[PDB]
């Protein structure tokens, strides 16, 4: 659907068997989720935002259903204040900006 | 225009007589720009992101031209890593998400 920006663009996602709410974030290259348990193996990583850096765990090729659209890609898990769907997955569900 | 997200959605802006590049950021409530000289009077403020918090100067009713669309609103100035156009201004230039 089209989404306007008067409110935070939140969507329901299903990942790792669990249901969550996440922000569609054009200002994020990567997808970053709050602490949650995801099955596979991972690789430590450091990502930088507005207030500095956080350590996250990088999971590759994770299935995510974003507003009922399926995508597979990298998901980062760590102490982000909010679940963020980044451009890496936005492209996969055909998400675009319009003005 | 319609913008895809295979790359960072960067646009050219004009503010305070100066030309800058800024990221269209659906994940940001407010607009935040790197240290620059802005004429107005300002109020101290504190904003939080992924790695913690930064102190910014809040300027109200600042004119901004974003890809040739004019908007007037609050602009925050401080040590952000990148110039961010947030939802407060995105709504004014009629910007939407689409998928
Ligand atoms: C490294 O350079 C940057 C680049 C972009 C950003 C923007 C944020 N996204 C962000 O934190 O992205 C992180 C994690 C996701 O992947 C990466 O994408 C680019 C960036 O390297 C890194 C996001 O879009 C908005 N943020 C908020 C989200 C966490 C919900 S905010 O900037 O902290 C921000 C906070 C309060 C206000 N009022 C205004 C902005 C910040 C700093």
**If you count DSSP H runs as helices and E runs as strands, how many of each does chain A have, helices first?**
1, 9
Cα B60–chain centre separation: 13
Spans of all domains in chain A: 1-99
Of A32, A35, A36, nearest in space to A46 by CA: A32
Structure tokens at A67: 């507003």
Structure tokens at A26: 């054009």
Ligand 1 pocket, residue A86 CB under 6 Å: yes
Chain B neighbors of A8, CB-CB under 8 A: 29, 87
Beta-sheet strand order (sheet of A96-98) = A2-3, B96-98, A96-98, B2-3
Distance CA A21, CA A52 (A): 24
Q: Which residue has the tokens 């939407």?
A: B96
Determination technique for this entry: X-ray
Distance CA A44, CA A56 (A): 6
User: Which parts of chain A fold into alpha helices (H)?
Assistant: 87-90
User: If you measure from the C-alpha of residue B50 to the centroid of ligand 1, how many angstroms do you get, rounded to a whole number?
Assistant: 7
Distance CA B97, CA B99 (A): 7
Of B66, B58, B75, B63, nearest in space to B94 by CA: B66
Contact B20, B12 (CB under 8 A): yes
Q: Which residue lies with its CA nearest to atom 3 of ligand 1?
A: A49
In terms of phi and psi (left: phi > 0; alpha: psi -120 to 50; beta: otherwise), the region of B6 is alpha
Is A1-99 in CATH node 2.40.70.10?
Answer: yes
- Count the Cβ atoms, other than its own, within 10 Å of residue B12: 12
DSSP chain B: -EE-SSS--EEEEEETTEEEEEEE-TT-SSEEE-S----S--EEEEEEETTEEEEEEEEEEEEEEETTEEEEEEEEES--SS-EE-HHHHTTTT-EEE-
Distances in whole angstroms, Cα of residue B13 to Cα of each of A41, A87, B19, B83:
43, 22, 6, 10
Chain A neighbors of B31, CB-CB under 8 A: none
Ligand 1 pocket, residue A28 CB under 6 Å: yes
Give strand pairing partners of B15: B18
Give strand pairing partners of B3: A97
> Half-sphere exposure (CA, 13 Å, Cβ side) for A5?
27
Give resolution, Å, one decimal: 2.0
Distance CA B45, CA B62 (A): 16
Distance CA B39, CA A59 (A): 46
């Amino acid at each position: 659907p089209q989404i306007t920006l008067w409110q935070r663009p939140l969507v329901t996602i299903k990942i790792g068997g669990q249901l969550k709410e996440a922000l569609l974030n054009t200002g994020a290259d990567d997808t970053v989720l709050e602490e949650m348990s995801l099955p596979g193996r991972w690789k430590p990583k450091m990502i930088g935002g507005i207030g500095g850096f956080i350590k996250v765990r990088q999971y590759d090729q994770i299935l995510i259903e974003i507003c009922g659209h399926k995508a597979i890609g990298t998901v980062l898990v760590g102490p982000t204040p909010v679940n963020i769907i980044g451009r890496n997955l936005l492209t996969q569900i055909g998400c675009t900006l319009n003005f």
